[PDB]
Each structure stands twice: as C-alpha cells, then as structure tokens.
PDB file of C-alpha atoms and ligand atoms in Angstrom:
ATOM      1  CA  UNK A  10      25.605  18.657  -4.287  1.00 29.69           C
ATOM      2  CA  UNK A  11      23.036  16.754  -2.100  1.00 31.37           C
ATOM      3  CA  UNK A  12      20.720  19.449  -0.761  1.00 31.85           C
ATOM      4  CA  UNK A  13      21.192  19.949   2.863  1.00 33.10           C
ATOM      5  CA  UNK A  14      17.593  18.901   3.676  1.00 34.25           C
ATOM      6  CA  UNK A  15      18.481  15.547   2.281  1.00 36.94           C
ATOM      7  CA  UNK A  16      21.798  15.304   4.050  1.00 37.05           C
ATOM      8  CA  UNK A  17      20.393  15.172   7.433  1.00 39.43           C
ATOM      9  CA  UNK A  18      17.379  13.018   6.801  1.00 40.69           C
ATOM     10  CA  UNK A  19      20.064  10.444   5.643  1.00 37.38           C
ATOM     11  CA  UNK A  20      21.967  10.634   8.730  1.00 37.98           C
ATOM     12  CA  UNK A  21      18.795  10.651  10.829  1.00 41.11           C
ATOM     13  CA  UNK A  22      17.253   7.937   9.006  1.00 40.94           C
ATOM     14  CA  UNK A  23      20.189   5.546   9.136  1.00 41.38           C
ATOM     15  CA  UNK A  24      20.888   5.917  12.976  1.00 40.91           C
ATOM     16  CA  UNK A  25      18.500   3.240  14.045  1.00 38.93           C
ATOM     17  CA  UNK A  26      18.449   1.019  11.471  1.00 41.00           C
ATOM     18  CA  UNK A  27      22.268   0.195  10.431  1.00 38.10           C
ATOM     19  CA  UNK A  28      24.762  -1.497  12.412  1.00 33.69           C
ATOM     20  CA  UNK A  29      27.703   0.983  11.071  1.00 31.33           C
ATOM     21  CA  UNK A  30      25.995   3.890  10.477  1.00 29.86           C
ATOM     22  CA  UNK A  31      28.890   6.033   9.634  1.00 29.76           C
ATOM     23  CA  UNK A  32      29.610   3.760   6.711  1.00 30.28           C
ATOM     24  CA  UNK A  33      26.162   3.960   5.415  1.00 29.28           C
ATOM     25  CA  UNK A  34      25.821   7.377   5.712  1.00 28.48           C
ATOM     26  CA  UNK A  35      29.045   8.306   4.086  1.00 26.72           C
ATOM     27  CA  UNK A  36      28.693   5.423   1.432  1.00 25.19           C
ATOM     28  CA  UNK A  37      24.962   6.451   0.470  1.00 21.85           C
ATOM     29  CA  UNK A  38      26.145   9.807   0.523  1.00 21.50           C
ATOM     30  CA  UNK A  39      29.157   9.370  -2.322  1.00 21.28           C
ATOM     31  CA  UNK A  40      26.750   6.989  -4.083  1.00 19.54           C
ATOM     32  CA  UNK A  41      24.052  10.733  -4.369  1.00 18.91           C
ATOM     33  CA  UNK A  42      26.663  12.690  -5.377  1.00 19.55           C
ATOM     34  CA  UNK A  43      28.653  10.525  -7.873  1.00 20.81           C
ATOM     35  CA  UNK A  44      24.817   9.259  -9.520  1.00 20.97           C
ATOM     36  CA  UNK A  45      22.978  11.970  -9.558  1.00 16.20           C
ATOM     37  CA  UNK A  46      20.236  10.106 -11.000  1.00 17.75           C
ATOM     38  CA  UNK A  47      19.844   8.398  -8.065  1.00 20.84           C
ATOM     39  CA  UNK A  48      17.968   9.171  -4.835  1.00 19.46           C
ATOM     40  CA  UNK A  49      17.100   7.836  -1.461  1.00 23.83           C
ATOM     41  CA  UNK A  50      13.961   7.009   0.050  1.00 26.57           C
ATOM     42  CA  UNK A  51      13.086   4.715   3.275  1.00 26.75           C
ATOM     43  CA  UNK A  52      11.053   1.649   2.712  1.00 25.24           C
ATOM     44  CA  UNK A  53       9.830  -1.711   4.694  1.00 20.30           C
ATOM     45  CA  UNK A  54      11.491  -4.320   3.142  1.00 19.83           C
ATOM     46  CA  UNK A  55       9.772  -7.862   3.149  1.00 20.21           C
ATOM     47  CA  UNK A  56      12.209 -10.729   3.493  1.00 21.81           C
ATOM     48  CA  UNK A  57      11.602 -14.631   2.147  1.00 25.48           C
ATOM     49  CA  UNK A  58      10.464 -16.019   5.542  1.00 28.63           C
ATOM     50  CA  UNK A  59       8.331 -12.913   5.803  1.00 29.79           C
ATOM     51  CA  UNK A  60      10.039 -10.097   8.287  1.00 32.67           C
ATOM     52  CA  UNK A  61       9.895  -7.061   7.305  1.00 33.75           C
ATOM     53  CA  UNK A  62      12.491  -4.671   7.995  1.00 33.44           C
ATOM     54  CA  UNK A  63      12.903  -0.590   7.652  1.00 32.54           C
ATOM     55  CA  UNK A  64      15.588   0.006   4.879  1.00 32.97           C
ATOM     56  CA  UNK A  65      17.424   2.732   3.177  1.00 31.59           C
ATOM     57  CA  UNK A  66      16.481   2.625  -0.478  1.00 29.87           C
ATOM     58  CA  UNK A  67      18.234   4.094  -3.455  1.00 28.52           C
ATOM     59  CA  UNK A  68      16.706   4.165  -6.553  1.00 26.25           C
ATOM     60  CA  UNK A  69      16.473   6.208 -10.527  1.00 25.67           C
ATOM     61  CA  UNK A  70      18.136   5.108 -13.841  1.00 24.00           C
ATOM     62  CA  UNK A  71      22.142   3.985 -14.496  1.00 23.97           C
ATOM     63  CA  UNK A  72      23.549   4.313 -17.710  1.00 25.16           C
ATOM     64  CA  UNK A  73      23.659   2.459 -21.004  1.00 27.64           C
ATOM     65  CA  UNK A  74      26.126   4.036 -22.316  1.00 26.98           C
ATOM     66  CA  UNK A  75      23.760   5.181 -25.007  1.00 24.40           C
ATOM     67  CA  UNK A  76      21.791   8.260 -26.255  1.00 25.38           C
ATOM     68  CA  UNK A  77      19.532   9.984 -28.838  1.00 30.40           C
ATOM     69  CA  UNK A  78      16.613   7.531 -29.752  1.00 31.21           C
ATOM     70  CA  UNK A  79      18.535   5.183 -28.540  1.00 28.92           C
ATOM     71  CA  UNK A  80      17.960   3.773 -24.869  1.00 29.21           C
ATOM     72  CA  UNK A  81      19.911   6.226 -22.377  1.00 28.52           C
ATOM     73  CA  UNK A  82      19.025   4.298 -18.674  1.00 28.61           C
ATOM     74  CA  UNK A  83      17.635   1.395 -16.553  1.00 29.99           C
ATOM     75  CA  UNK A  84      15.621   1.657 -13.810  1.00 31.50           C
ATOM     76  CA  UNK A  85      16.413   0.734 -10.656  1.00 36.56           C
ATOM     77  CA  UNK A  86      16.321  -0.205  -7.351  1.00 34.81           C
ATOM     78  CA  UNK A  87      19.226  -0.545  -4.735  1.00 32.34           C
ATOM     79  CA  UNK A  88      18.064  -2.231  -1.036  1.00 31.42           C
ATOM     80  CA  UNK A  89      21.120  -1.331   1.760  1.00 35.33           C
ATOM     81  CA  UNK A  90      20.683  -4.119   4.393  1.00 34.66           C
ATOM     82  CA  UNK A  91      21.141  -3.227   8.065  1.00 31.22           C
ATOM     83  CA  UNK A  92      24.771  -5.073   8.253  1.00 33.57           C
ATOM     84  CA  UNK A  93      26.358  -2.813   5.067  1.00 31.72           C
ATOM     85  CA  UNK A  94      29.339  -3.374   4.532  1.00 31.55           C
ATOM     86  CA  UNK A  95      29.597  -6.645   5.502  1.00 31.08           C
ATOM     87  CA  UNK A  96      26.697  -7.780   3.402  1.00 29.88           C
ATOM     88  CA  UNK A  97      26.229  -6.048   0.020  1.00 33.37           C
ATOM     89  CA  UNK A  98      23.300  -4.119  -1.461  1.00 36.99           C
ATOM     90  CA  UNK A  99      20.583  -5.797  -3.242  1.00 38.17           C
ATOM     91  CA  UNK A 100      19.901  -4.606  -7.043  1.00 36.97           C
ATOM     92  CA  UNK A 101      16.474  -4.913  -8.706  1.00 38.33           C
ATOM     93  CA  UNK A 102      15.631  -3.804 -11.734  1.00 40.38           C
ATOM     94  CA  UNK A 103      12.668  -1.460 -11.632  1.00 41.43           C
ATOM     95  CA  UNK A 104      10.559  -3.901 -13.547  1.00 42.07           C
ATOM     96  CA  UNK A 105       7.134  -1.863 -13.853  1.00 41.09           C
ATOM     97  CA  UNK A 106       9.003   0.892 -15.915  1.00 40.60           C
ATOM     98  CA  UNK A 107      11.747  -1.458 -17.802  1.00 43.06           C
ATOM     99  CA  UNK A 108      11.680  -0.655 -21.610  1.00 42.90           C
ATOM    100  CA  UNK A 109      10.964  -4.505 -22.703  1.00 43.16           C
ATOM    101  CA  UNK A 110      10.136  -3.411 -25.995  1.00 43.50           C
ATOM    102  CA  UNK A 111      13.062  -0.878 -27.037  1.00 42.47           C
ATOM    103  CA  UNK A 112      15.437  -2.316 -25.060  1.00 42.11           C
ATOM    104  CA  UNK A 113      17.792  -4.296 -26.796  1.00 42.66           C
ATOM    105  CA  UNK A 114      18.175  -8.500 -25.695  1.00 46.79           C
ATOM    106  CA  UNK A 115      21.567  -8.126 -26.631  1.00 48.56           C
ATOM    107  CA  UNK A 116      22.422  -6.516 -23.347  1.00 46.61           C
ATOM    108  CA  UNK A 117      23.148  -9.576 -20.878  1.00 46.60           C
ATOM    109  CA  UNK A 118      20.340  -8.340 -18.337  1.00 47.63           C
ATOM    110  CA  UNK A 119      18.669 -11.658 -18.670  1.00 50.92           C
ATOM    111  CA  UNK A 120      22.097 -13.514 -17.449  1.00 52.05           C
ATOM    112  CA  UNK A 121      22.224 -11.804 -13.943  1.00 48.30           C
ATOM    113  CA  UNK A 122      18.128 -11.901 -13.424  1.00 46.14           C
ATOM    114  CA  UNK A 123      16.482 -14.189 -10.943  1.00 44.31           C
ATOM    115  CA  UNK A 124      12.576 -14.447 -11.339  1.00 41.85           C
ATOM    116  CA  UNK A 125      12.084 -11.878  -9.128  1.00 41.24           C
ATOM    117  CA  UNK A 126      14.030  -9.152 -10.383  1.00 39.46           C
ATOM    118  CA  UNK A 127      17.128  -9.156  -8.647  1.00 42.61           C
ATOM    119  CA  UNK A 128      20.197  -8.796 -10.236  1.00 45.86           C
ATOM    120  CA  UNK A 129      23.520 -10.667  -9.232  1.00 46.03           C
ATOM    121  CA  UNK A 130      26.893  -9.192 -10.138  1.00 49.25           C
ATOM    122  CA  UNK A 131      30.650 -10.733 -10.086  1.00 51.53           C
ATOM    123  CA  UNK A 132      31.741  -8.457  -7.458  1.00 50.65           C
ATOM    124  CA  UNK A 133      28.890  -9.867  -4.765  1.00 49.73           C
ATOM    125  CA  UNK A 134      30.499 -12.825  -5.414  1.00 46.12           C
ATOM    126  CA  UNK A 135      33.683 -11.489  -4.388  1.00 48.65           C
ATOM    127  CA  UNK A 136      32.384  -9.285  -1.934  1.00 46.76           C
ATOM    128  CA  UNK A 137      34.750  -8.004  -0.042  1.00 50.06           C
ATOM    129  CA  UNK A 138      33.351  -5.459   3.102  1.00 51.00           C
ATOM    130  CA  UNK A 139      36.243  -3.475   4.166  1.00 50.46           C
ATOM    131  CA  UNK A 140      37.974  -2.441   0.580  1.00 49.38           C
ATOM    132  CA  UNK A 141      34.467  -2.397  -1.377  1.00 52.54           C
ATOM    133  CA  UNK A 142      31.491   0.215  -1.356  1.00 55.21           C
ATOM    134  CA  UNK A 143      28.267   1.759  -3.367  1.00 54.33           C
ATOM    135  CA  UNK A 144      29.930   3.193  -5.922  1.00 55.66           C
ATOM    136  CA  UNK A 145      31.811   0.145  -7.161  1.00 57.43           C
ATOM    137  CA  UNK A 146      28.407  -1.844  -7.189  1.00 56.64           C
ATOM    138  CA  UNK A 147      26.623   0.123  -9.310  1.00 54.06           C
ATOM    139  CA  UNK A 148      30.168   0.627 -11.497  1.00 51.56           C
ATOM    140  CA  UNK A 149      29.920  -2.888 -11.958  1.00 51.85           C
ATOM    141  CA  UNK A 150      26.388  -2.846 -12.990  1.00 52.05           C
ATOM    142  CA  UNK A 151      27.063  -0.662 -15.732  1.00 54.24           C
ATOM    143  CA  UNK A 152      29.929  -2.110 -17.242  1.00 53.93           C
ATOM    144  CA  UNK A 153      27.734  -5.842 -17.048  1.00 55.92           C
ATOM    145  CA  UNK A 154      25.177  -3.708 -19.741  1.00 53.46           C
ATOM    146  CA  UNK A 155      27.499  -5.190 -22.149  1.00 53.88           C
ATOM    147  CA  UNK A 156      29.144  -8.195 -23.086  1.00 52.94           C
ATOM    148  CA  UNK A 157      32.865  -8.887 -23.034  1.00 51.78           C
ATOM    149  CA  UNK A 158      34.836  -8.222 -25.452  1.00 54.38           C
ATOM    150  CA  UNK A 159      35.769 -11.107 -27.746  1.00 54.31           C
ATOM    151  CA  UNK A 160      38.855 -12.806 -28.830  1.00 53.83           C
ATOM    152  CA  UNK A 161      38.991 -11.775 -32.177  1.00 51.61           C
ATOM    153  CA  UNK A 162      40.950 -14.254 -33.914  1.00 50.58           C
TER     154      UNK A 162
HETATM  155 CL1   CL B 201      19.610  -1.150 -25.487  1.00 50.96          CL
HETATM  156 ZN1   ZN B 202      25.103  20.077   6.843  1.00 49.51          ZN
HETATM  157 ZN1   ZN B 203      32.401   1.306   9.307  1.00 45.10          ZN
HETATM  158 ZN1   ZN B 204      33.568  10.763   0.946  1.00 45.68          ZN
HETATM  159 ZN1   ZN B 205      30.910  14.180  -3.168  1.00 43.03          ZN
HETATM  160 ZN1   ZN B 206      24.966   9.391 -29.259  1.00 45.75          ZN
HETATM  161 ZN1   ZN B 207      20.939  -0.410 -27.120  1.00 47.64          ZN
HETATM  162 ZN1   ZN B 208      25.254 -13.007 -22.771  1.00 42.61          ZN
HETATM  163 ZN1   ZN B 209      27.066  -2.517 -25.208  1.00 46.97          ZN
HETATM  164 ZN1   ZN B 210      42.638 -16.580 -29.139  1.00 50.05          ZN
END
C-alpha cells in the first residue's frame, strides 16, 4: 500500500491547488498503488508565457515489457494540472536519465516526442474527463512502447 505518511500529504497537498480535489486525490492515489514505481512529489511548474504554478508531480520508470540485460523501464515524469480531469496530465520523458544508448530506436518514442520532451498519446486526443483517469494514461503509454501489429499478408 501507500504508506500512511504519504496518504495525507497527498490530500493536504492537493487541497489548494486543484479545482476537484477529490478526483485528484483519489486518481493520484490508484495511479501509487497500481505503479508502484511511481511516486509523488510537489513541484513549481513553469508554463510557455512564463507563470509558474505549484503542481502535483508523479514520477519513476513504466515498463517495457522487457527484462534481463535487456531494457526493463523509462523514466518519467507525469505533471497533474490544476483543472484534472478536465484537462489531462502532461508526460515527459525523464530525459537526463533516458538510456539513449541501450535503448532500442525501434520503440516509437521518437513519434510521440516534441523537442522538449513531452510525450503526446492517442487517448489526449480523445480525452475524455468524466469516463477517463491516471491509470489509463500511463496504460496507454506502455502499450505505445511498441508498434502495431502488422497485417501480415
Ligand atoms: Cl528497448
Ligand atoms: Zn489514513
Ligand atoms: Zn470530481
Ligand atoms: Zn479507488
Ligand atoms: Zn489500491
Ligand atoms: Zn525475460
Ligand atoms: Zn528493447
Ligand atoms: Zn514508428
Ligand atoms: Zn515491443
Ligand atoms: Zn491485408
């Protein structure tokens, strides 16, 4: 489980900063304890004309679906903005600590990266606030380590 310590930061943390508060607190919350290579931390954010704003962060390594010498995670950084659910999480990849060199090209990373590390997905083009949540964002990020499967014929 989340430790308890944790638990209560989150929900004191989130008060003042989110509009729905309940729904980032749960959310965050089933995000911890279905990833538990994730964690949260609190962070001022710096936005493109310059404001910065006190955020939840969540951040650690999602899966590649691989293991031994093989690459096993990605590092990265989730940014909850203050209107969750109604607008989506940011995704960065962690780019100081991102194996370039081991990492394979063949994992379609470089289709979903803008210049400045942030990662788009299909479903934040499809976002849709009331039926959607953490959990199915970083889902989706793992299952976009890969490319489609083919037709075969
Ligand atoms: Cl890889
Ligand atoms: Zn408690
Ligand atoms: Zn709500
Ligand atoms: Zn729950
Ligand atoms: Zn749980
Ligand atoms: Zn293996
Ligand atoms: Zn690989
Ligand atoms: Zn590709
Ligand atoms: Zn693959
Ligand atoms: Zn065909």
């Amino acid at each position: 489980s989340v430790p308890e310590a944790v638990v209560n930061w989150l929900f004191k943390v989130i008060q003042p900063i989110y509009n729905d508060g309940r729904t980032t607190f749960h959310d965050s919350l089933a995000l911890l304890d279905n990833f538990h290579s994730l964690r949260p931390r609190t962070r001022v954010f710096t936005h493109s004309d310059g404001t910065p704003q006190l955020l939840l962060s969540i951040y650690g390594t999602i899966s590649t679906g691989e293991d031994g010498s093989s690459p096993h995670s990605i590092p990265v950084i989730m940014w909850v903005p203050s209107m969750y659910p109604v607008k989506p999480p940011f995704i960065s990849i962690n780019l100081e600590n991102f194996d370039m060199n081991t990492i394979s090209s063949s994992l379609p990373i470089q289709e979903y990266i803008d210049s400045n590390g942030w990662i788009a997905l299909p479903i934040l083009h499809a976002w849709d606030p009331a039926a959607m949540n953490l959990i199915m964002v970083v889902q989706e990020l793992m299952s976009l380590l890969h490319e489609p499967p083919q037709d075969q014929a």
